[PDB]
Amino acid sequence: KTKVRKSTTFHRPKTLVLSRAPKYPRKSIPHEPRLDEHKIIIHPLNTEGALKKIEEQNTLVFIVDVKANKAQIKQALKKLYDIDTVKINTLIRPDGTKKAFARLTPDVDALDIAATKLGLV
């Protein structure tokens, strides 16, 4: 009348589990995507060393949001200035803001990009 048990240990039987099907959302409006491009990119850096590498290395220096990562910075640059980069280096300055060195692709000139879109000369 009883089932055969080949193991001397008892395991909790697996039972059906159901996904949540709430009859009301807990929050009504999903939040808009925080940290979009307009928040990611703040302003270009126009110091001596920032402008030096625009010519010497074909890279643009920006001040970006402190919680933005390299992928977000790359996507924001592409969306906001149609800029394609080969790599982006980042640091956090002693003042607490993030500085990003974005090296452009060799076919695009950082001087023209800065002159026409960034207002830098």
Partner: protein, 234 residues
């Protein structure tokens, strides 16, 4: 087709120390969960201890044939359902809308009586003709006095198997006690037959066994040990 020459036997010698044991049924010694363990040990303890007669009288229940006869009678008098009550109320509503008084369209109902307090009051007033007490009332207290009350009031009773059985008879989950007071004339003879059969086939047999204490039955190994001791002595 004859068997090919290269099929042969590889019997396994499961003796001590020469082969891995086969996967046999180990259901006798599984580490059961605590609720199962307590469930079985509870029954074991009630068998081991001496049960006072008032509780021990409940292990003598109605036989299968007598229970079948009793339920055959009772299934004609199980109470009305929700739909039946709604239909009766609707037709009474048409009656008193027509102006004919209530209880003219409907007739006197004959139904089995349930509910512990209601049944106790019925047998106290001697209106109950036959009482069936469930044998497995979780707090036996609720029914431990019922056989004595029925004996005092001179009403035939039977301890029947199935609290859930009485419940499904009466359209509930459990009933724990059932009483029949009056039946229709077409089966008053059936009621008399059932009462006489219940009396002479349960009460007369349990007249003496209901007075003795519940057994202090020991376990299987203890019983075997005592048998061996007695056999060796003799």
């Amino acid at each position: 087709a004859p068997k090919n020459p290269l099929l042969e036997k590889r019997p396994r010698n499961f003796g001590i120390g020469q082969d891995i044991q086969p996967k046999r049924n180990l259901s006798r010694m599984v580490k059961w969960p605590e609720y199962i363990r307590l469930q079985r040990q509870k029954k074991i303890l009630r068998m081991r201890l001496k049960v006072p007669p008032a509780i021990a009288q409940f292990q003598y229940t109605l036989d299968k044939n007598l229970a079948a006869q009793a339920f055959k009678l009772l299934n004609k008098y199980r109470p009305e359902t929700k739909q039946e009550k709604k239909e009766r109320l609707l037709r009474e509503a048409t009656a008193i809308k027509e102006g004919k008084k209530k209880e003219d369209v409907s007739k006197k109902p004959y139904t089995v009586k349930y509910g512990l307090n209601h049944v106790v009051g019925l047998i106290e007033n001697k209106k109950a003709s036959l009482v069936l007490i469930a044998n497995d009332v979780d707090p036996i207290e609720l029914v431990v006095f019922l056989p004595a009350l029925c004996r005092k009031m001179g009403i035939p009773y039977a301890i029947i198997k199935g609290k859930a059985r009485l419940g499904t008879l009466v359209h509930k989950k459990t009933a724990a006690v059932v009483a029949i007071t009056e039946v229709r004339s077409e089966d008053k003879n059936e009621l008399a037959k059932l009462i006489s059969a219940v009396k002479e086939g349960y009460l007369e047999k349990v007249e003496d066994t209901r007075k003795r204490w519940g057994g202090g039955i020991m376990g299987f190994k203890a019983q075997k040990r005592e048998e061996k001791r007695k056999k060796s002595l003799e």
